Amino acid sequence: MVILGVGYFLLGLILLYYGSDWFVLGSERIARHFNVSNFVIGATVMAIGTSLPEILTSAYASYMHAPGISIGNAIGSCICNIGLVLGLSAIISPIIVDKNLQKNILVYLLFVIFAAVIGIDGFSWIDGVVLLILFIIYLRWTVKNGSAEIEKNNPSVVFSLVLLIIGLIGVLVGAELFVDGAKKIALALDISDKVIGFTLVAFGTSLPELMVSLAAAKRNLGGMVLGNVIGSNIADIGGALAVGSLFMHLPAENVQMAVLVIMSLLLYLFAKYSKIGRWQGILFLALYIIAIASLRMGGG
Ligand SMILES: CCCCCCCCCCCCCCC
Ligand SMILES: CCCCCCCCCCCCCCC
Ligand SMILES: CCCCCCCCCCCCCCC
Ligand SMILES: [Ca+2]
Ligand SMILES: [Ca+2]
Ligand code: NA
Ligand code: NA
Ligand code: NA
């Protein structure tokens, strides 16, 4: 039963590795097909695709009367996407943000500040509906401003969509196998710890973002990286958190929200007045490390 766990674990890593690169390549081609920037494709198709685990997890957790896990997973993913995912990626491929993308990031920041303020007393189903509506508006606004609309079944298109979809299946299945594999290893060795397992929920669901962002960074696709991070956070709030709140009132996470707000503000300030490169990435990593060293365990 331990060899099966090791099997899943290694296999999940393989799928994650190759799948992420396929997803990126297919997404980069699709962007060129539709005449939209890499940021746009990153913030929409990629962000949502990779946030499907958060959405499902938050929904499932709140339905099972564990709303703390529901919001813990959602906001923890956001902190992970900036501190760990963007941190690593910025070091690998530093980014200077153009003026139009700076505007997108400011909208993101406002969205996050708005979510923090209405969530001070926790999140109701009404808070959820509002956030989901802003999420949809964000998506349409983003696509419009990053689109140059001008124009059977071209082999370039097909191969693009195949890469993208198979890549996405690869990263999502791979993330699942990684986690399921780890869990059966821990169970087999009798080192299973539930509160540890619930602490790592936002991470396991963030493995697609991590591997996808790293693959894009290796190909110097900085805008795509930034799109994936910014979009995943909005999807995690207007999607994962929001849907959670539909089943049950979510408890406040004011400390984690303050952390997210601070990291999000830092991200905008770097984008606007500087760059997102080596030392910005180092700072994001240091803050992430401080966060996981100090924040209360249990995943909510
Ligand atoms: C943004 C212009 C200044 C760049 C240098 C200051 C921002 C990066 C600071 C990194 C500090 C890293 C500390 C690690 C412990
Ligand atoms: C090309 C590699 C450049 C340096 C990468 C440094 C990463 C530092 C991450 C944080 C270390 C711990 C800080 C603890 C407060
Ligand atoms: C370099 C400016 C940092 C401003 C915020 C400083 C305190 C740390 C905030 C982020 C990480 C989580 C801290 C609480 C665990
Ligand atoms: Ca074409
Ligand atoms: Ca509220
Ligand atoms: Na995502
Ligand atoms: Na995710
Ligand atoms: Na996550």
The span from the CA of 191 to the CA of 180, in Å, is 15
The span from the CA of 41 to the CA of 59, in Å, is 25
Residue of 111, 70, 123 whose CA lies nearest to 244: 70
CATH topology of domain 1-35+151-192: Methane Monooxygenase Hydroxylase; Chain G, domain 1 (6.10.280)
Residue whose CA is at the smallest distance from ligand 2 atom 14: 286
Backbone angles phi and psi of 168, in degrees to 5: -65, -40
Residue whose CA is at the smallest distance from ligand 2 atom 7: 282
Residue 99 class from Cβ within 10 Å (0-12 exposed, 13-18 middle, 19+ buried)? exposed
CATH topology of domain 36-150+193-300: A middle domain of Talin 1 (1.20.1420)
Q: How far apart, in Å, are the Cα atoms of 93 and each of 78, 86, 96, 216?
A: 20, 10, 10, 9
Select from 269, 283, 289 the residue to mutate for testing ligand 1; criterion: most ligand atoms less than 8 Å from CB: 283
The span from the CA of 135 to the CA of 111, in Å, is 9
Q: Which atom of ligand 1 is nearest to the CA of 275?
A: 1
Residues 6+ apart with CB under 8 A from 111: 134, 138, 234, 237, 238
Residue 214 class from Cβ within 10 Å (0-12 exposed, 13-18 middle, 19+ buried)? buried
The span from the CA of 279 to the CA of 165, in Å, is 35
Other beta carbons less than 10 A from residue 151's beta carbon: 6
Q: State the method.
A: X-ray
Q: Where in the chain is CATH 1.20.1420.30?
A: 36-150+193-300
Contact criterion met (CB below 8 Å) for 175 and 53 = yes
Contact residues of ligand 2, CB 6 A cut-off: 91, 278, 282, 285-286, 289-290
Q: Where in the chain is CATH 6.10.280.80?
A: 1-35+151-192
What's the distance, CA 125 to chain centroid? 22
The span from the CA of 182 to the CA of 5, in Å, is 6
Contact criterion met (CB below 8 Å) for 268 and 105 = yes
Q: Is the CB of 96 under 6 A from ligand 1?
A: no
* The two structure tokens encoding residue 113: 């500040």
Residues 6+ apart with CB under 8 A from 192: 183, 186
The span from the CA of 51 to the CA of 30, in Å, is 19
Select from 280, 287, 289, 290 the residue to mutate for testing ligand 1; criterion: most ligand atoms less than 8 Å from CB: 280
Contact criterion met (CB below 8 Å) for 189 and 11 = no
